[PDB]
Structure formats: structure tokens, C-alpha cells
Amino acid sequence: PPLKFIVKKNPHHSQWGDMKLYLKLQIVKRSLEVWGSQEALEEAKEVRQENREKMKQ
């Protein structure tokens, strides 16, 4: 299902607020569904940072 969000003005200045906020539980559930497991997500972020280091070098 689509994930809803709340457009809440930032507690800081009125410079550019109106930030979107999502429920943490829904985001975690969606991430687990997409990636299968938390270990897969950890491996994905590790290989992403490794690729970032490879690209910068």
C-alpha cells in the first residue's frame, strides 16, 4: 500500500521547511519487504559505500 506522510513545517527558521515526515514503523516494514531482510539491507549499504569509495578513488 502507498505510504502516507505529514507535511510539517521545520522547527527551524521559515527558510525552507514544510518537510515530509513518514512513520518509522511503516518505513522499516517497507524496507524489509523490498530488501527481504535487515542483513540484506546492511550488505547493500556496505557495498554502496564501498562503491562510493571506489568511484572517488
Add this chain to the structure above:
DNA sequence: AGGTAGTCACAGCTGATTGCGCTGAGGATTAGACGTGCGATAT
């Protein structure tokens, strides 16, 4: 000795990724009292 498989000079495409434009809030940047001066005027 013959055939072909990479390989490099470009070019194209794709999928991402991350990177700056979108404004807005908390901190450093000359006309009345007071005198004079002068001229018309009390003793």
C-alpha cells in the same frame, strides 16, 4: 600457415546517483535650546 577473438579510436543508450537551486530567519553596521550679533529704542 589460417581464422578469429579481443582491443582501442570514437559514438549511442540505459540504469542509477548526488548535487545544487528554491528563499527566508538570528546577529553586526537634520530641527529645537543656546549662544551671539545687530539695529531700533528708554533715561
